[PDB]
């Protein structure tokens, strides 16, 4: 038996933090860009893999959830934790491009990497 979907977004994420969650001296800020990332898009869109994931699906896991409740701002900052996560995909040679820089997200610039010790 092949064990279906090896490689996925969560695959990445839980391996990334295994690694990068390790202690680290640059600003002690705390875990809520972790709690959103992973609460929202590896029961969405985590179980695909990166190389499959569409734009489209990123848009629309900004859209359906903003119908679900969420506060324009918060989902605003899903956005852009999402895009700089991601995007160390991108540098690690495993991702070709990122889907966010084709999706249709909402505007707001990059706060970059506040991480954790």
Partial sequence: ??????????????????????????????????????????????????????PADIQRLYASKLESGLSPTRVRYIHVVLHEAMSQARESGLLLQNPTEAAKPPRHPLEHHHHHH
Avoid: C, F
């Fill in 1 to 54: 038996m092949i064990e279906p979907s090896k490689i996925t977004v969560e695959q990445w994420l839980n391996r990334w933090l295994t690694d990068y969650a390790k202690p680290h001296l640059r600003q002690s800020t705390w875990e809520s860009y972790e709690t959103v990332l992973r609460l929202h898009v590896i029961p969405t869109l985590g179980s695909i893999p990166l190389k499959k994931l569409q």
